[PDB]
Amino acid sequence: EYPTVSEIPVGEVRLYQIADGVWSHIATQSFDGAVYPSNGLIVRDGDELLLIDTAWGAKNTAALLAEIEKQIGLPVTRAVSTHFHDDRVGGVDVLRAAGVATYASPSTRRLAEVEGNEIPTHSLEGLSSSGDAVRFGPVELFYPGAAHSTDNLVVYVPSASVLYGGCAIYELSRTSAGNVADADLAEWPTSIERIQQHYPEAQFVIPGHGLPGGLDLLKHTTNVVKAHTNR
Ligand SMILES: NCc1ccc(C(=O)N[C@H]2Cc3cccc(C(=O)O)c3O[B-]2(O)O)cc1
Ligand SMILES: [Zn+2]
Ligand SMILES: [Zn+2]
Ligand SMILES: [Zn+2]
């Protein structure tokens, strides 16, 4: 029942309710002639919503906000971007213009600037060392160490045992490396181990791209990254 890449035209956004007050958002984007799905998260915080990640571009993110207003009808007041690439910050200007306060770690803000990408306004403190965690409204933000990118964060929703891994976690159908130009292959398995150690109770694990599963997605990702290391 989870929407798949073949079911979502580029420019449209789907919402998937995971638990009371917890949804993923799913969009698609063209990249080198192929179409990829991408996931983010929406978490209810009282009568407001917290958004995790844009929907990969300004047009998709505008559609995301329209879809949230239509289907949920509560204001998105804050958003967190889990790393500096365009599937996570692309659309931050649309969010900002809509009154959403945008956040990212200082590491992400710096890398986005260097890269010429959109830059979340607010800096999240307390995430600069591997293994650091902070509570941000209804979620916990965790810096596991460098993996898909040096700045990547993961997000946990304690009320629903939902772990959103972002692009540091691969879906099961992905059996070879994705986009790894900015990755730290040497540290990626260690960073995943920090995730497993901190969130052993996670029930629903969401990759940056594709289908959710359980905690098996962590060991899956390690296997793929190690095989790519040994290419
Ligand atoms: N300057 C080189 C460069 C250009 C684009 C991207 C980029 O936007 N990458 C995103 C889109 C994408 C495209 C294909 C696979 C993935 C993935 O997460 O593996 C994926 O997620 B990224 O965050 O790395 C990264 C580096
Ligand atoms: Zn990335
Ligand atoms: Zn502000
Ligand atoms: Zn990605």
Handedness of CA 93, 111, 155, 214 (dihedral sign): positive
Q: Determine the straight-line distance between the first and last CA of the chain, rounded to whole angstroms.
A: 35
Is 12 within any annotated ligand binding site? yes
Do 3 and 29 touch, CB atoms closer than 8 A? no
As residues whose CB is below 5 A from the ion ligand 4, the structure lists 87, 167, 208
**DSSP structural state of residue 32:** T
Q: How was this structure determined?
A: X-ray
In the structure encoding, which two tokens stand for residue 222, read together? 């390690």
Q: 231 C-alpha vs ligand 2 centroid, how far in Å?
A: 21
**59/37 Cα distance (integer angstroms):** 15
Strands 132-136 and 139-143: antiparallel
188 ligand 1 Cβ < 6 A = no
**114/75 Cα distance (integer angstroms):** 31
Q: In terms of Cα–Cα distance, which of 69, 79, 8 is closest to 42? A: 79
Domains plus CATH for the chain? 1-231 (3.60.15.10)
Handedness of CA 100, 83, 2, 135 (dihedral sign): negative
Do 8 and 37 touch, CB atoms closer than 8 A? yes
Counting from 1 in the atom list of ligand 1, the atom nearest the Cα of 86 is 8
For residue 150, the tally of other CB atoms under 10 A from its CB is 16
Entry resolution (Å): 1.4
Q: In terms of Cα–Cα distance, which of 41, 48, 7 is closest to 25? A: 41
Would you name the residues annotated as active-site residues? Answer: 83, 85, 87, 148, 179
Phi and psi for 65 in degrees, rounded to 5?
A: -65, -40
Residue with token string 């497993």: 196
Tell me the one-letter amino acid at 122: H
Is 220 within any annotated ligand binding site? yes
Counting from 1 in the atom list of ligand 1, the atom nearest the Cα of 167 is 18
Burial of 130 (0-12, 13-18, 19+ CB in 10 A): middle
Q: 229 C-alpha vs ligand 3 centroid, how far in Å?
A: 41
Is 85 within any annotated ligand binding site? yes
In the structure encoding, which two tokens stand for residue 120, read together? 């979340």
201 ligand 1 Cβ < 6 A = no
Any idea what the Cα angle at residue 194 is, between residues 190 and 199, rounded to 5°?
A: 150
Is 25 within any annotated ligand binding site? no
Do 35 and 28 touch, CB atoms closer than 8 A? yes
Do 42 and 27 touch, CB atoms closer than 8 A? no
**225/231 Cα distance (integer angstroms):** 10
207 ligand 1 Cβ < 6 A = no
35 ligand 1 Cβ < 6 A = no
Q: 209 C-alpha vs ligand 1 centroid, how far in Å?
A: 11
Length of the chain equals: 231
Counting ligands in written order, which one lies closest to the CA of residue 57? 1
